[PDB]
């Protein structure tokens, strides 16, 4: 109790929410969930190799791509091993395990990367480490240092009756029309049954005091069924709130309830699904209710069926389709691609059908046998699927994911916890397991959970319980890491928002500001700022002290901070400072998602030996409209390269890039590479942005490295037309008006390969894009979500798609500077 409450403070300061608080819950669910998550926490904590956990070797079973193979001579990889300053080069083969390399080092005469908490340990071949593959791709040498493994002790752990509901009335404290209440019984996002009250004049207190008798029987209520209470005006929806009709102990909800309701701001938004109630009881609308009750197959049908099974995830099912899928459900089980369609053809408001559906879930040889399809697995974890067991088979497949892929899918998986009916779920538990098993995963699980907790009232309660359960088993080592980080974030937060209000949005940075900033940065160091702190978007990097002279406020309207830090690691093999941008202004949950998709797109292209050279820079959301961003070194915008010669006077030149590239590459050998890198990076960002529908961008939101690597930024803003940015300046680097060239040919090659590669995972991209808009972008209608199928040319064959994209290139060359110039004209 003495140091159980001191701990519960520690946990609360990390989470950013008090889980033990019971001021905004009307049942035992959050607490029961906390209780429930001890077993799975301890099961994974107990079954945890102390040494492999402590060194968290980042490894992958995927094959070395063909583009990355073809920079190896004769099984030669030169690992430069260090000790104090006695550097020594060793040739090893791709199959050589790190242990063998140590055995043949002491002979011929544990590893850790230089400047990083990243170890090359365990029974894995050297080629199957991600740090190695990173160095190979960027064309760099693999310097390590031999030191003793860190102590694993540091990671120590501490009725046939119809359903009926009385609508007593609603209570809005202050109005500054007529209203009616609508009560829906929902499962997934299909309304089973629906009843409505009569309208009454809108007062601070309306009382109906009426029984809404539904048709559906009480026995036919499925688990995961919501009572969705909605208030309408007079017709517009004003407030909403949800209540699990079947509670977490399989008990029908009964008794008196006074629910504080969520407001509407004028869609598929996952906040609309939440079982949480509005915590702001003072200002929010309230509602008061009472629950008193307590063979063969014809060939033409097979082809109608297979036509349905083949269709995309956003292609709706007619009732004709659904009767067919249902009737031939045992035939539909043999195809895993049918499963979302099939379980969406179930009448969930009938006990008999659900029973049969559960018999259908008893009989799953093929699903279990089948290879992991994440696109298909993911479909079963969205808003459409409320059934505990339908969802749980999906999580089953996720079990077989390796840590590499879990990282790929972690953000979208954390978002999908919102679609879960109950706080305690297989997915919730899955995440807790994989975060406790792996520190890299657990580091990112922390911030992703903290992200939502910090700016989601609808889901902070559920997430906070999950985060608390992670924190209680992640090990004293990391509790300290997370503490140092949080401290540093919250400290640098104060500075950013305080500095932002010290100057007007119209006025730029002045003598007033730069002095004030540098003053505060000096105050913070000598106070209670930790020596080092692990960089959230790259937990390998320990960051040290502020290089205060290099820190500044950026001439923006958002006044973000350009911060630079010394590497706290002494064995770091350079003095290049760690650059981080702190920014209040935009919501970086949107950017995070977009970047996560970019990485998924890189891994899709890796399956077909393609490198399209994207820079998904690090970007974490830390709190409410605050986050930080990785600074890409030696990088500028396309706008500034235009300004460098011309000025701030439109009139865009074509040859101003090539000069900049020839200016910033010492050798012609490197210029060739800096054009090669540009042609890929450009093409990758052309394809990627087109499909996502964020291709039409200002060119100060497009950046480039001095090594030619192009990359888009600031997806917050975007979230007289052109598919994507392919300006005449880019085309001159390719070597073009309106004619072809050696490099522009390979641009169109690379592009088409990239476009067609993505279309091979049409269903994955569609389900991720849908989920992204539902969990991530409050700014969504069906037509927003059903944009992607058009961009991915669903239905069209291989050839029409190849031609569809080439046409989109020709809109860019026909528009030239017209659209980009209109973007500059948006300075009035
Ligand atoms: C732009 C800034 N420089 C940079 N240099 C390197 N890497 C960066 C990486 C990411 C970003 C970045 C990514 N997403 C967002 Cl939402 C933002 N938002 S903002 C613009 O800070 O308000 C920034 C900027 C970077 C610069 C200054 C002056 C001149 C030329 C560019």
Residue numbers in the entry: 144 to 252, 271 to 319, 357 to 374, 379 to 436, 458 to 489, 496 to 523, 545 to 969, 981 to 997, ...
Sentences from the paper on this structure:
Here we evaluated the pharmacological profile of MTX-531 that was computationally designed to selectively target two key resistance drivers, epidermal growth factor receptor and phosphatidylinositol 3-OH kinase (PI3K). MTX-531 exhibits low-nanomolar potency against both targets with a high degree of specificity predicted by cocrystal structural analyses. Here, we show that MTX-531 acts as a weak agonist of peroxisome proliferator-activated receptor-γ, an attribute that likely mitigates hyperglycemia induced by PI3K inhibition. The reversed binding mode of the quinazoline core between EGFR and PI3Kγ was an important element in the design of MTX-531, which shows low-nanomolar potency against both of its intended targets.
Whereas the 6-position of the fused ring of NVP-AEE788 points out toward the solvent, this position in omipalisib extends toward the back of the adenosine triphosphate (ATP) pocket of PI3Kγ and the specificity pocket. We leveraged this flipped binding mode of the quinazoline core between EGFR and PI3Kγ to computationally design potent and selective dual inhibitors of both enzyme families. X-ray crystal structures of EGFR and PI3Kγ cocomplexed with MTX-531 confirmed the postulated reversed binding mode of MTX-531 to each target. The 1-position of MTX-531 forms a hydrogen bond with the backbone amide of V882 of PI3Kγ. Unlike the interactions seen with EGFR, groups at the 6-position of MTX-531 bind within a hydrophilic region of PI3K created by hydrophilic hydroxyl and amine groups of Y867 and K833, respectively. All studies described here were carried out with the (R)-isomer, which is ~100-fold more potent against EGFR and ~10-fold less potent against PI3K than the (S)-isomer. Collectively, the observed binding mode is consistent with these isomeric potency differences. MTX-531 exhibits low-nanomolar potency against purified EGFR and PI3Kα with half-maximal inhibitory concentration (IC50) values of 15 nM and 6.4 nM, respectively. The strong potency of MTX-531 against multiple PI3K family members and mTOR reveals a biochemical profile distinctly different from clinically approved alpelisib (Piqray) and copanlisib (Aliqopa).
